[PDB]
C-alpha cells in the first residue's frame, strides 16, 4: 500500500468503440478533484502485451480520444488515469476493443 496521498478521483465509464477511422474511447470526468485537472493518460495494449502509453498527455477536460493505433485480429486494451500535477489518479476500468468483423458488412 502507501502510494502517496492525494484528493484526486480516477475516471469512470471508460469504454472503447472500434471505428473505421480508429478507436474512440469514452470516459467520464472525475467529479473529485483537488483543484484542476492536468490531463489523463491513455494506456492500452494487445491482449496481454506491455502496457503501452498511447497518450499520457490528455486534455483534463476531454471525455474521449481516438486511438487508430490498434491491431486487427487482436484485442487492444485501454486505461485512463487522471492526474493533477504532482497528484495522480488510478487508471479507470480497463477498456477492450474488438476487431474481428470491424470494417465490413453487418446489419445491426
Q: Give yes or no for a contact between 66 and 26, defined as CB atoms under 8 angstroms apart.
A: no
Overall number of domains in the chain = 1
Pairing of strands 40-46, 76-77: antiparallel
Interatomic CA distance for residues 66 and 8, integer angstroms: 24
**Tell me, what CATH number does 84's domain have?**
2.60.40.10
Query: Domain residues for 39?
Result: 1-108
Interatomic CA distance for residues 55 and 78, integer angstroms: 11
Method used to solve the structure? NMR
- 20 by Cβ neighbours in 10 Å (0-12 / 13-18 / 19+) ranks as exposed
Q: Give yes or no for a contact between 66 and 22, defined as CB atoms under 8 angstroms apart.
A: yes
Q: Which of 35, 25, 30 is nearest to 55 (CA)?
A: 25
Q: Say how many C-beta atoms besides its own lie within 10 A of residue 21's C-beta.
A: 7
Amino acid at each position: 500500500g502507501s502510494s502517496g496521498s492525494s484528493g484526486l478521483s480516477p475516471p469512470r465509464g471508460l469504454v472503447a468503440v472500434r471505428t473505421p477511422r480508429g478507436v474512440l474511447l469514452h470516459w467520464d470526468p472525475p467529479e473529485l478533484v483537488p483543484k484542476r485537472l492536468d490531463g489523463y493518460v491513455l494506456e492500452g495494449r494487445q491482449g496481454s502485451q506491455g502496457w503501452e502509453v498511447l497518450d499520457p498527455a490528455v486534455a483534463g477536460t476531454e471525455t474521449e480520444l481516438l486511438v487508430p493505433g490498434l491491431i486487427k485480429d487482436v484485442l487492444y486494451e485501454f486505461r485512463l488515469v487522471a492526474f493533477a500535477g504532482s497528484f495522480v489518479s488510478d487508471p479507470s476500468n480497463t477498456a477492450n476493443v474488438s476487431t474481428s468483423g470491424l470494417s465490413g458488412p453487418s446489419s445491426g
